[PDB]
Structure formats: C-alpha cells, structure tokens
Amino acid sequence: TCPFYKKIPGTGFTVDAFQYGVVEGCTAYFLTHFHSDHYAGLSKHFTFPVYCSEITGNLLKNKLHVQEQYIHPLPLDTECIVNGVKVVLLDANHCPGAVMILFYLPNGTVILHTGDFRADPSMERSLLADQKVHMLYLDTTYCSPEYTFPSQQEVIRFAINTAFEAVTLNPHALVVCGTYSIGKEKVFLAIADVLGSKVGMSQEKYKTLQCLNIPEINSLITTDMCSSLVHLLPMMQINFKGLQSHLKKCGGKYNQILAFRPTGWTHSNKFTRIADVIPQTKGNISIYGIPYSEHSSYLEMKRFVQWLKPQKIIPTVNVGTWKSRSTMEKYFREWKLEAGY
Ligand code: NI
C-alpha cells in the first residue's frame, strides 16, 4: 500500500509510486527520475498514464519497454495542464532527466516535490521565484551537519589531474571508472576528454547512454573496448580481484590500472580534504574513492529551504526510524527560527 508522502492531496496524482499495484484514485502517475528505487514496479505491461521528462521517457520506452501510448513527456520550465491541474517540471540537478514538480492545486495551495535533488543557488531564479509554496516534499538524504563534501567542479578537477598525471607518466596505464545507474557521467566523460580517448563500455550501458540527449555523444563513447583507454565497468567489479581479472582480458596492452569509485558521502569526508585524498593500492592497481554527490549537502539544503520559506515540510528520505524523523524535525525548526518565517 502506497505511503502518504507519495500522494498529492486534492488531485488524482502520485509521485514515484509504481510498486504498490493499482493505487486507488490515481489518474496520473508521475516519475521524477530513472533510478530503480523510484521506478520500482514499471514494465511493458503498465497501462496507466506516466508523466515525466523527455529523457526519462526515452529510458522507459528503450530500457523498460513501456509502450509509447502510456508515456507522456513534458518540457521543462513550461506551464502544462494535466487532468485539469497546472504543473511545471524543473531541473533537479540530480542525474540526467531528473525533475522537481510544482503542482498548483485547484484550492490555491502550491506544492513543490523535489524528487531527488542537489540544491543550488541557480534554483532561486527559476519559476520558483514568482510565488509562494505551502508544502515542500523534500529530498532529505543528507539532512545532518556531518554531511559535507566538495563541489562537483572540485571533484572533477581532482579526477582529471590525477588521470592525466598517471597516464603521462605511464602511457601503458588503463583508467577504469565504476557505474551502477545513470548519473555522474561527468566523471568518465571529463577523464576521457583530457586523455584524447572515447569511453569504452558494454552494449547495455551504451544503450542507456544513447537515451540521455547528451550533445555530441557519438563522438564520446564506444562499444569497441580495444580502441579506448578509459573503460566503464559495473561498480561491483571495482576491487582488486575484479580489476586483475579485467587487466588479463586486455591482451597485454596495459600493465597498470588506475580506477575510480564515485561514491556519495563516506566518513573519510569528516577528516580529509579532496586535495589530500589517496588511493588504495595493491601491486600495479590503485583505486580512488571520490565524493561526487548528486544530492544536496546539509548546507546547500539549509540554504534552499531558508530561501523558499515553506509552510510545511514532508521528508521523502530517512523516514523509517523515529530517531531520523526527530533529528530532521529539529533542524527544520532551527532553520525556521534562525530565518524568521
Ligand atoms: Ni536518485
């Protein structure tokens, strides 16, 4: 049964609610982004209207085989009427195709559902600027002050400089980057650009990348592993055993691997600056964990909410424990007292 924080009161609508069967009263199912915890339940047999971005729609059709007649893509930054209710989709600064949804309820209430997001000051000049929001359904993944990490630009700077140094010292080194979902494509694209290489990957991952509307993508990626010196592999294979086994398959072309695991936050963030990060090494294999996040830091989240000044907040992440829920409620009250709304 569908939980309350996935329902939009005063409408026929749900958000990211595909794993509960036929939801009673639901006339349109919104999908914020193509990540498995959110799409869980969709398949080619789904027969209700799905509303989403163009990119999410490409993935639904090609990867999950949802039939075209049930896919309803909407442009961003554009007022649209859905089953008699005005909606707007906004870029969520998460993975490709990820949106926030603004719902203008027939009674005058305005609701923002962030989906998953990485808050940014640029959002303060979107269509959010123009009116008041009563209810915020908020991605609270990192809602605690211990969660710090650097900008995405600092992280990419570190990775580019690391890869270019290693391969210039040793032209026979291979770079490998882990992946298990869409998102974080800048990591592998930036490294391949500095090295003058295409990114090599499986047929299944190439298929997924071809759904994302990235400019000039045919110039950047390939299924011909032999022609490429940046390879993508499943995240599960980014360990000493998995990488040893991959180096065997490369036909003595390479004699060293430098690999990247983009994670979210890890507790080595509490002590170490990005500049100071070091790898784990065994023989001719080195593995860097790099803190590339597609969710808001605590400070970014706090800034956004203090700017928006919502009347009520409904968390969508970490809602399963009493300790979590109490911690989050305390920070929301601090923020409101500090800012005066
Ligand atoms: Ni996500």
Curated annotation (Swiss-Prot):
Q: Where in the cell is it found?
A: Nucleus
Q: In which tissues is it expressed?
A: Expressed in brain, heart, kidney, liver, pancreas, placenta and skeletal muscle.
Gene induction? During mitosis. The mRNA encoding this protein contains an internal ribosome entry site (IRES) in its 5'-UTR. This 5'-UTR generally suppresses translation while specifically promoting expression during mitosis, when cap-dependent translation may be impaired.
> According to its UniProt record, which protein family does this protein belong to?
Belongs to the DNA repair metallo-beta-lactamase (DRMBL) family.
Function text: May be required for DNA interstrand cross-link repair. Also required for checkpoint mediated cell cycle arrest in early prophase in response to mitotic spindle poisons. Possesses beta-lactamase activity, catalyzing the hydrolysis of penicillin G and nitrocefin. Exhibits no activity towards other beta-lactam antibiotic classes including cephalosporins (cefotaxime) and carbapenems (imipenem).
Q: How does it assemble?
A: Binds constitutively to TP53BP1. Binds CDC27, which is itself a component of the anaphase promoting complex (APC). Binds PIAS1.
- This protein is called what? DNA cross-link repair 1A protein
Q: Which organism is it from?
A: Homo sapiens
Identify the coding gene.
Answer: DCLRE1A
Which residues of the entire protein appear here: the answer is: 700 to 1040 of 1040
